[PDB]
Amino acid sequence: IVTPEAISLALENHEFKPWIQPVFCAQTGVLTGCEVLVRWEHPQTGIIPPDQFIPLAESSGLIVIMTRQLMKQTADILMPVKHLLPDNFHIGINVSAGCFLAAGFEKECLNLVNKLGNDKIKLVLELTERNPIPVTPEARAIFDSLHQHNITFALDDFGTGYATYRYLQAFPVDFIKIDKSFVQMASVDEISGHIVDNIVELARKPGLSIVAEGVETQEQADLMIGKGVHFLQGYLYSPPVPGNKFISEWVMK
Amino acid sequence: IVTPEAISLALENHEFKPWIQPVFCAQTGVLTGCEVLVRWEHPQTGIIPPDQFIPLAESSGLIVIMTRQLMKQTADILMPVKHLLPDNFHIGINVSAGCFLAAGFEKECLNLVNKLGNDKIKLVLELTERNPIPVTPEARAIFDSLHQHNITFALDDFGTGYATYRYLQAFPVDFIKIDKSFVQMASVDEISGHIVDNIVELARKPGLSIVAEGVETQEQADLMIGKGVHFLQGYLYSPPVPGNKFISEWVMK
Amino acid sequence: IVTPEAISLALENHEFKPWIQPVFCAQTGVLTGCEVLVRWEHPQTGIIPPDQFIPLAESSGLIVIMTRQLMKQTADILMPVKHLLPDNFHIGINVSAGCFLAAGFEKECLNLVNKLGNDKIKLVLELTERNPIPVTPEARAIFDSLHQHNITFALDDFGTGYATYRYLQAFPVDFIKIDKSFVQMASVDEISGHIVDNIVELARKPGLSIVAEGVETQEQADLMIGKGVHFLQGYLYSPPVPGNKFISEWVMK
Amino acid sequence: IVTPEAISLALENHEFKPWIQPVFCAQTGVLTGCEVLVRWEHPQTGIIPPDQFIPLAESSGLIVIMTRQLMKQTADILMPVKHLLPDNFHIGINVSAGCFLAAGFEKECLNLVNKLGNDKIKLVLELTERNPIPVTPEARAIFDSLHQHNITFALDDFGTGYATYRYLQAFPVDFIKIDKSFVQMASVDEISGHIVDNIVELARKPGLSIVAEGVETQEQADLMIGKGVHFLQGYLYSPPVPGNKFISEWVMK
Structure with missing residues (x-):
């Protein structure tokens, strides 16, 4: 299949x-x-x-x-x-x-940034929670190299998989994206809201930005906004859409 | 071998x-x-x-x-x-x-507690970071059953392996043990201290207790104490010792 | 489960x-x-x-x-x-x-043979088709050592899994056990009977003995006997039984 | 790398x-x-x-x-x-x-045969020993379909990997290619020659043709010829060569 x-x-x-x-x-x-x-x-x-x-x-x-x-x-x-x-x-x-460690990765990131404008755009590499970057000198060298080229990093789906405090300690990333399981459960259960507060406090000292993923309802958004989250993403605003429709709906109007 | x-x-x-x-x-x-x-x-x-x-x-x-x-x-x-x-x-x-889900586990925990005094001692099951308990109804039933019997839980080596915010959300544990990699790096690096602060803030709302593991030097201890950690453990006080020596050094004098 | x-x-x-x-x-x-x-x-x-x-x-x-x-x-x-x-x-x-290569295997085989009579019994190690012995000097040394101690070998479920001509070439075994899928299909299909003939011819030159597994009906047995198979095993005679019943039915009467 | x-x-x-x-x-x-x-x-x-x-x-x-x-x-x-x-x-x-089960495979085989002459050439799909075709109705349907189109099959490197009697039972192939490890060891060791005889006897009933692979010396060839092998292949005659050189050496002269 x-x-x-x-x-x-x-x-x-x-x-x-x-x-x-x-x-x-x-x-x-x-x-x-x-x-x-x-x-x-x-x-x-x-x-x-x-x-x-x-x-x-x-x-x-x-x-x-x-x-x-x-x-x-x-x-x-x-x-x-x-x-x-x-x-x-x-x-x-x-x-x-796997992508992060593959030969030619840095080059592909530069090509994207150069085509679009070194200073107009900010490339954010959203590191996955399933297949974490190994905590090694060589990984850190690639990470630092990309940073020197003004490319930035996010810990994606933070709070799930291998997206732990350790990754923040090993790699000074620029963004944390809160997994939707916390965004959507904050105010259904007893800890999810507290977890979001915790991610907000976590980010504050090193000065990282937070994005709430999976924002589906207005009450979820208001809640995330109130708690000091910087960016929002989810079906409440728009699901993912084909490129032409992205341009037509969100850029060119 | x-x-x-x-x-x-x-x-x-x-x-x-x-x-x-x-x-x-x-x-x-x-x-x-x-x-x-x-x-x-x-x-x-x-x-x-x-x-x-x-x-x-x-x-x-x-x-x-x-x-x-x-x-x-x-x-x-x-x-x-x-x-x-x-x-x-x-x-x-x-x-x-594996141990937590095995037939007969709850019984073994009760036998320990009954032999030693239901109310004199507190059994703390230190859940490992490598082989996390699955997030299922059946796991939660075993967890709740043990809680009803006054047995308690710790997330061990918190901040490493699978010891994530999610485990705190799925299982209302009683203790968090901070991995030694944060205890020992707090004030060598730029985030480890901040991570400990974060674990302290995390615990405060649900009212969990924290233990710092791997306390090796007096400055590490003072630092952990200052940050609001509740319990301390490590080579500064004592390494692990044979039982007879534990009794002789720490109980019977 | x-x-x-x-x-x-x-x-x-x-x-x-x-x-x-x-x-x-x-x-x-x-x-x-x-x-x-x-x-x-x-x-x-x-x-x-x-x-x-x-x-x-x-x-x-x-x-x-x-x-x-x-x-x-x-x-x-x-x-x-x-x-x-x-x-x-x-x-x-x-x-x-795994068993064949584990520390202490040869010793366990000797203990069995010594307890029962070095010369009354013949221990036959039935090598599985799923997890074949690697074709290495060290494996061959263990194999030869056991042979020197009058322990013998069978290729089990021959014709399936990894039970190939190569295993016969690498290890001079003493028996071949024909997988039941050939025994039971010989005279339902067009090749299974031919395959049994082939296994019989295979054994003849080096002088190996053959056992037909899964003999379930009298016609299957007659067919295997006619084709020159040396030993028979299956539900037609008896399924496997508890030890006491093995002794009572087949040894002590 | x-x-x-x-x-x-x-x-x-x-x-x-x-x-x-x-x-x-x-x-x-x-x-x-x-x-x-x-x-x-x-x-x-x-x-x-x-x-x-x-x-x-x-x-x-x-x-x-x-x-x-x-x-x-x-x-x-x-x-x-x-x-x-x-x-x-x-x-x-x-x-x-993987290739055999992929969408579009049959079509690719037909394109080859139609370009070269439906009746001048015979396409032989040499099924590998490492990644055997699963023994399922759907696999057999693809196999039968290709046969109806006059495409033929070989069990490659027979006697190694998963190239077992079972594959011959499940799929009525047209050729068996003897792995070079038997061809080259026949008359160095005690069973390899016997194994080739066995493959020759195996083929005879259903009327399959045999090719000996890895024929490297004249004595290996004579031996294979004597034992009733139908086709020969190996460095004794020629290694593989670029297409232009294949045409120039073996077709166009």
């Missing part, structure tokens, strides 16, 4: 598309950036969602190709409209350890 | 001994409890340290036997002196998911 | 029993030996068949303990009646690569 | 070349066919041999692309000279389970 060969074939047939989800300033509601997500549109049978292919992409290693293509395609999509983007427009790309 | 069969044989030959490390009130320096640790004394060749056998104990499943024996032996060691123990004396036992 | 810890606990609780299946001379119908098989009798819920635990026993490594116990228990079962066993009575034990 | 991304890049840069090894009638020495093998010529550093990339091609799934390209390129190479090929000229292509 879903195999490494089917993923390879799908990459060659360009069936993996960059869908783009806007991200907003929590204070003002204004567009500040986006996240690039992947959708597999199988020509006959339809969507195969990330949950069914990403893991196998990761274990097979094909994720490296997929992420490279996605980065390239995102540059193509946003280049025509880059002069219309707000200043300091954030572009979130999901990065696993 | 180290195999599952060698571990089995070593269990039958009683080569795995409960060594006991005292734990202290951070405010006053007073003895409040202990942790039970395992040492493998191979008759010819000497110590085989936990790092070389625990993982294989865990993957083989033999850990369940080992932990059961350790619990039993700890009861035997402390029973003669239980009337000399301070009130609310804490006994820390390291528990993996 | 079935875990490594449950297998460990079951080993300690002696829930894994040696059941014994007789093996017969194809020419005469006479008892020539047996195979020792394992049955897990779970005290409440009943049988857990080999298909559900062996693989996990193998990957966890616990198989080494289980096989050792089975060998020991087989000696205990047959010792009281060893003087009643036919001469050259074969005892088949199922052995994986 | 060797990664899935490097393999992808190498495919796009056409660094994987079809080298072709002739195959001959054992009786007469006459050219009867060929096998298509892959060589990775890295532009700076030189050859990367199959042992270092095939496994990763297979696990990544990229093998499907590579095999497709190889099939296409083989058609291009032989088309100009197809009228010069002997009748019933065999073309051996190495096929793993």
Whole structure:
């Protein structure tokens, strides 16, 4: 059904598309950036969602190709409209350890930034919780090198998987994205709200910015805003959308 | 060299001994409890340290036997002196998911507590970071059952492995033990101290107690005490010691 | 449900029993030996068949303990009646690569043979098809050592898994056991019968003996006998049975 | 060094070349066919041999692309000279389970055969021993479909990996290729020769043809010929060579 060969074939047939989800300033509601997500549109049978292919992409290693293509395609999509983007427009790309450590990764990040404007945009590498970067000198060298080139980092889905305090200690990242399981449970249960407060306090000393993921309702947003979260993202504002529709809805109007 | 069969044989030959490390009130320096640790004394060749056998104990499943024996032996060691123990004396036992989910686990915990005094002692199950308890109804039922019997829980080596905010959200534990990597780096680096502050703030709302592990120097202790940590443990006070020596040094004088 | 810890606990609780299946001379119908098989009798819920635990026993490594116990228990079962066993009575034990390479394996085989009579019995190590012995000098040394001690080898379930011509080339074994899938399909399909002929021709040059497994009907037996198979085993004669019943039915009458 | 991304890049840069090894009638020495093998010529550093990339091609799934390209390129190479090929000229292509089960496989095989002459050539899918086709109705349907289109099958490297009697039982193939480890050891050791005899007897009933692989010396050939092997292949006649050289040496003279 879903195999490494089917993923390879799908990459060659360009069936993996960059869908783009806007991200907003929590204070003002204004567009500040986006996240690039992947959708597999199988020509006959339809969507195969990330949950069914990403893991196998990761274990097979094909994720490296997929992420490279996605980065390239995102540059193509946003280049025509880059002069219309707000200043300091954030572009979130999901990065696993495999991609981060692969030969040629830094180069691919530079190509994206140079095409779009070294100083107009901010590339945010959203480090995944499943396949954490190893805590080694060589990993830290790649991390520092990218930082020197004004590329930034997020701990994605923070509070789940391997997204622990240790990653913040080993790597001075720039953003923390709060997993949706805390955003959506804050004020259903007894600790989730407290956990968000904790992530807010965590960020404050080193001066990191926080994004709440999975914001689905207005009460969730108000709650996140009240607690000092900096950016918001979720279905309340918009799900991820095809690039042309991202441009048409959120950039060019 | 180290195999599952060698571990089995070593269990039958009683080569795995409960060594006991005292734990202290951070405010006053007073003895409040202990942790039970395992040492493998191979008759010819000497110590085989936990790092070389625990993982294989865990993957083989033999850990369940080992932990059961350790619990039993700890009861035997402390029973003669239980009337000399301070009130609310804490006994820390390291528990993996495998042990926690095994048939007969709750019974073994009760046997320990009943032998030593339902109300004199407090059993603390120190949940490991490597092999986390699954987040399921059945796991939560076992957890709640043990709580109803006045047994308590710690997230051990918090901030490392799978010891994440999620575990605190899924399981209302009673203690957090701060991994030594934060205790010992707090005031060498730029975030470790901040991380300890964060763990202190985390605990405060639900009213959990914190123990700093790996306290090795007086400056580390002072630092942990100053930051509001409740209990201290480490080589500064004492390494783990054989039971008879634990009793002789810390209980019976 | 079935875990490594449950297998460990079951080993300690002696829930894994040696059941014994007789093996017969194809020419005469006479008892020539047996195979020792394992049955897990779970005290409440009943049988857990080999298909559900062996693989996990193998990957966890616990198989080494289980096989050792089975060998020991087989000696205990047959010792009281060893003087009643036919001469050259074969005892088949199922052995994986893990058991074969584990420290202490040769010793366990000798203990079995010495207890039962160096020259009355023939121990047959039935090498499994799933977890083949590696083709290395060290493996061959263990193999040769055991041969020098008059212990013999079978390629079990030959024609399936990794039970290939290569194993016969690397290890001069003494027996081939034909997988039941060929025995039972010989004269349903177009090649299975031909495959059995092939295994018979294979054995003839080096002078190996063949046992047909899974003999279920008289026509299957007649067919195997006609094709020059030396030994027969299967439900037609008897399924595996508890030891006491093996002794009572096949040895002591 | 060797990664899935490097393999992808190498495919796009056409660094994987079809080298072709002739195959001959054992009786007469006459050219009867060929096998298509892959060589990775890295532009700076030189050859990367199959042992270092095939496994990763297979696990990544990229093998499907590579095999497709190889099939296409083989058609291009032989088309100009197809009228010069002997009748019933065999073309051996190495096929793993992944390729065999991938969408579009049957079509690629037809394209090769139609380009070269439905009745001049015989396509032989050489099924690998490492990644066996699963024994399922759906696999058998694909197998039967290809057979109806006059495409044929070989069990490659028979006697090693998963190349067992079972594959012959599940799939009525047309050829068996004897692994070189038996060809080259026949008359060094005590069983290898016997194994070849066995493969010859195996083939005879269903009427399969045998090819001896890795024929390196004249004595190996004479031995294989004497034992009733139908086709020969190996360095004694020719190693694999670039296509142009295959055509120039073995077809066009």
